[PDB]
Amino acid sequence: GEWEIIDIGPFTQNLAKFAVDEENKIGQYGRLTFNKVIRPCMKKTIYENEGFREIKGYEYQLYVYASDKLFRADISEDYKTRGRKLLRFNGPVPPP
């Protein structure tokens, strides 16, 4: 329910590589290789209680160049398990 912009350093690079790896498993456009993550990187924090504040998890929304094409990837991350899932991977999209 709450959003912020985060940096595009190693953490974000790694998330984008995760997205590329997960997309390559479903392979609905051949096999891709990670080039770069670009700004902006959005991080949504999902809370138990619009009001109350235990964090349930997150979503990251990234712009990722892979095999020279620009994609929008959304990744969920569960707060308790720390487990991540590729939610969607759409593109080519225009540059933000």
Within 8 A by CB and 6+ apart from 1, the residues are 44, 45, 46, 47, 50
The answer to whether 23 touches 32, Cβ cutoff 8 Å, is: yes
Phi, psi of 23 (to 5 degrees): -65, -40
How many residues are present in the chain?
Answer: 96
Helix (H), strand (E), coil (C) string for 1-20: CEEEEECCCHHHHHHHHHHH
Within 8 A by CB and 6+ apart from 37, the residues are 8, 12, 13, 15, 16, 62, 63, 64, 65
Check residue 30 and report its DSSP letter: S
> How was this entry determined?
X-ray
- For this experimental structure, what is the resolution in angstroms? 2.0
Name the CATH architecture for the domain at 1-96. Answer: Roll (3.10)
State whether the Cα torsion 56-75-4-2 is positive or negative: negative
| Tokens 């990722």 found at | 64
